[PDB]
RNA sequence: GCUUGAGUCUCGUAGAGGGGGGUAGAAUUCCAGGUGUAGCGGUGAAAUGCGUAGAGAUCUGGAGGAAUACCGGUGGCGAAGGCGGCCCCCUGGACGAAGACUGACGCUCAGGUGCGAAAGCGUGGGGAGCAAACAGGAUUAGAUACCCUGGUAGUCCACGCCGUAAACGAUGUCGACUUGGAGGUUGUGCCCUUGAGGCGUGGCUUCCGGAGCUAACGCGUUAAGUCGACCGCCUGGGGAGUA
């Protein structure tokens, strides 16, 4: 969001933006009240997060490689 | 990973913004459980001590203040 | 609410000490107690309907246990029902 | 007699009124069989946001215990007066220990 | 409150009435009465003046005190009565010295309530105080244009003004019609809505309901000949002209106001 | 023209167009510049190298006030908003802060249903 | 009579449970003023629209309404519908620990009664944003559509009516029994707080899978397994949830 950079500093680098409000909370207000889907996405956003965390762990195969 | 409300003793007070204004980010937001790591009875009363110090003017509701 | 201090005074009341506490009579009581007390927050507020389902789980249960006291026996149900003021 | 605690900020100009002000409900309470606990008076301090700008209001702490029709007359004196800017006031479950 | 009568016979059939039970019914306080008598819409000339008014049921005038002039005594209401000038109920007030006044009826005021008037009066819905000492944003009644006029704005049934704004020695009034509008800050107010505000619901039923409250029949324009209204005429309900009032005037979006004398203490017109 | 010595490079990029206007340190305006204004109309509007020459065109009409460091608010999502700053850099300026002023509300009024 | 069912009491524990009032901040919009100047807005591309009568951008101040970013979570509460700012007031339920009390007071329930998203209706207000309808511009062979610029009812509040949803874990309610694993959430006891541990024990909950069942898919101790108790319902597709 706001960032100084102290007088010698040659390049921005504004991280922050990418870790606070930028585009994320941004794009998602734009449009589409919906009031429906931030149930649905929102459950297969951790739907496919358990199968990110389960499956992930247990990919140990021989595979060949 | 090493929660500091449940390490001692805690209810969260909402007039000692030392402790309090570590587990608020720099443009005012609260930070979440996954990041910081308190057990989810210590978020609850957290962030029922943001609000209520951001309404007696402790804390700020955002940096655009 | 039915308070601490509310509650102890009916117990007494209604049934042998103190200790007593969950008699068929001093159920009815106390279930009579709360009733009463919330036709007063019934009076206003008129849509708190969960609430209203509470009323009506105590109203249902102390018509039940009337109905077992009738039952029960007839001597010590004629008791209540002038004593606690409901009955046609 | 629940418990109590009452935030007021006091608008910074008339803060030679706060010790006025600090009697001025201490008297209401205490004079209405209400026991006070812990006037941890803040004093002057700088805010996160300005409230109408004015900044640096004046902090008040009470923490009473005061029967319900006495802490709400306290409560509309709070909006008429000029002078008290945002109070709150909170939950019983005890009285503190000064708690800065 | 609201009772919807049963069509027994035709003009009972949409009745409305507006009953209040806590109203006083005996006869009023006399000596705060004195007689009212009707006009018919005429003037010193004996030509009419205001039509469609005539008529009506004897109402006497009942002494109203508007002006409260009566600073840090307490009243106790006695009984609220019926007015029929106003559309509001009034309250008989009894003072702590022996003096009984009638005042406007407040929303919350019933019989036995305390009011008191002057600088040094709570902020309790039915007290009437200056607006030096009213806090922003209240809602007040019973408002005066001047101080010491009286009481001029917001006092019919259910009728309020809320306070926006103080701007130095003016108090910046929100009417009721939605118009912004200033006046001095030494003017009294009574803080909190007017009573009766059921008094829009009723609907009269019949066309002799209108004939006892002294309203007369409004004959149309279309319905004369031209010599009578510039409307009217015509072989079957012709119209074609732009409407227009009795004497020529234009009606239906014209504006009528022009004064140049009051229109400092105007912030903003009725939208 | 008052020689102005610091001012305020308000940034306004939204996804169509971007709009880069020089204020004060009071914050009244001294010179703008749009992507649209430069050219670059229709689909070449929304892009990164237009707001870079509506960053060096709204680096004169201020050269009448002597503007030597400037003070960064950018506002809103788009191709500007990144490259509008490295161009704030390449006309001579030097950076004091960047923020990002973006109005975000706090779950507000309702935003609108398109783009199906 | 008895107490292992059900219930009552005493201490606590969490909770967007419910109703009532108040307040806070960010943003949108509009108005008023200052600066400032030719574009803004929008799109796949444009145009309608706005703007030299000075918009858009920018700053200050004001007025309003509605919703509560972060917290926030196949997390929590409620019978379901559903319920998110903080605060106070009035209330409902669930759970845990230790006892003490009642002594089968229970479960299900046709008819009945109550509650019941959203849209809708009625009366009175409120109207920022959004938005059916409608107007205009586009796209198109056409475009009474998607797309664009606007915009009424409506969403909002109080009080009534309506009684419907893919009102859906498409799965009635209640009880007993039958291998496990990883989590979450809320209590609680033991042990070393001995250092962000070690062990039991309850309630709720998510996922994966064993027997078993199933037509299969799959469910799989909050069963669609093995049983019991009552209830609702089904009997080929349309016609028809219609006359």
């Not at chain 2, 001590?49 to 007696?56: H, N, V």
């Not at chain 3, 009815?28 to 708190?48: P, R, S």
């Not at chain 6, 670059?40 to 002597?66: I, M, N």
Request: hydrophobic share 35%; net charge positive; aromatic share 6%.
């Amino acid at each position: 969001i706001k960032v100084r950079e102290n007088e010698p500093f040659d390049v921005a680098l504004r991280r922050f933006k990418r870790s606070c409000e930028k585009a994320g909370v941004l794009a998602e207000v734009r449009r589409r009240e919906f009031y429906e889907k931030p149930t649905t996405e929102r459950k297969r956003a951790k739907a496919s997060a358990v199968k990110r965390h389960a499956k992930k762990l247990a990919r140990e195969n021989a595979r060949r490689t | 990973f090493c929660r500091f409300t449940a390490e001692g003793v805690q209810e969260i007070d909402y007039k000692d913004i030392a402790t309090l204004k570590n587990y608020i980010t720099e443009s005012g937001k609260i930070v979440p459980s996954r990041i910081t790591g308190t057990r989810a009875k210590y978020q609850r009363q957290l962030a029922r001590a943001i609000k209520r110090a951001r309404y007696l003017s402790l804390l700020p509701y955002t940096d655009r203040h | 609410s039915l308070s601490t201090e509310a509650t102890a005074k009916i117990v007494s009341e209604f049934g042998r000490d103190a200790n007593d506490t969950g008699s068929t009579e001093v159920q009815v009581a106390l279930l009579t107690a709360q009733i009463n007390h919330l036709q007063g927050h019934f009076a206003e507020h008129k849509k708190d309907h969960h609430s209203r389902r509470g009323l009506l789980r105590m109203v249902s249960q102390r018509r039940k246990l009337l109905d077992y006291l009738k039952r029960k026996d007839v001597a010590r149900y004629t008791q209540l029902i002038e004593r606690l003021g409901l009955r046609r | 007699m629940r418990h109590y605690e009452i935030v007021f900020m006091v608008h910074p100009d008339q803060s030679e009124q706060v010790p006025g002000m600090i009697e001025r409900y201490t008297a209401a309470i205490t004079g209405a069989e209400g026991k006070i606990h812990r006037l941890e008076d803040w004093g002057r301090r700088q805010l996160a946001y300005p409230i109408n700008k004015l900044h640096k209001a004046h902090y008040v702490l009470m923490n009473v215990e005061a029967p319900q029709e006495v802490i709400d007359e306290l409560e509309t004196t709070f909006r008429f007066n000029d002078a008290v800017i945002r109070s709150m006031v909170m939950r019983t479950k005890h009285a503190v220990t000064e708690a800065s | 409150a609201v009772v919807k009568c049963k069509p027994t016979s035709p003009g009972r059939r949409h009745v409305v009435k507006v009953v209040n039970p806590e109203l006083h019914k005996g006869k009023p306080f006399a000596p705060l009465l004195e007689k009212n008598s009707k006009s018919g819409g005429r003037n010193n000339n004996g030509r009419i003046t205001t039509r469609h008014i005539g008529g009506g049921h004897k109402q006497a005038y009942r002494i109203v005190d508007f002006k409260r002039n009566k600073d840090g005594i307490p009243a106790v209401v006695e009984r609220l009565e019926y007015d029929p000038n106003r559309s509001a109920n009034i309250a008989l007030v009894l003072y702590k010295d022996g003096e009984r006044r009638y005042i406007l009826a407040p929303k919350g005021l019933k019989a036995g309530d305390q009011i008191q008037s002057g600088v040094d009066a709570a902020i309790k819905p039915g007290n009437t105080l200056p607006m030096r000492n009213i806090p922003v944003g209240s809602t007040v009644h019973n408002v005066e244009m001047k101080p010491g006029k009286g009481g001029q704005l917001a006092r019919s049934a259910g009728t309020y003004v809320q306070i926006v704004a103080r701007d130095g020695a003016y108090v910046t009034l929100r009417l009721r019609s939605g118009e912004m509008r200033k006046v001095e800050a030494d003017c009294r107010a009574t803080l909190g809505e007017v009573g009766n505000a059921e008094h829009m619901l009723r609907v009269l039923g019949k066309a002799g309901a209108a004939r006892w409250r002294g309203v007369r029949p409004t004959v149309r324009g279309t319905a004369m000949n031209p010599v009578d209204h510039p409307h009217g005429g015509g072989e079957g309900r012709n119209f074609g002209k732009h409407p227009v009032t009795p004497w020529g005037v234009q009606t239906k979006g014209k504006k009528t106001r022009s004064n140049k004398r009051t229109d400092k203490f105007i912030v903003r017109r009725r939208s | 023209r008052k020689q102005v010595s610091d001012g305020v490079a308000h940034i306004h990029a939204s996804f169509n167009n971007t709009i880069v206007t020089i204020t004060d340190r009071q914050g009244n305006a001294l010179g703008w510049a749009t992507a649209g204004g430069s050219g670059f109309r229709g689909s070449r509007k929304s892009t990164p190298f237009a707001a870079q020459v509506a960053a060096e065109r709204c680096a004169d009409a201020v050269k009448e006030y002597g503007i030597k460091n400037l003070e960064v608010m950018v506002k809103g999502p788009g191709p500007g908003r990144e490259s509008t700053i490295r161009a704030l850099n390449a006309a001579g300026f030097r950076i004091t802060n960047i923020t990002d002023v973006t109005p975000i509300p706090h779950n507000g009024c309702r935003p609108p249903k398109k783009r199906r």
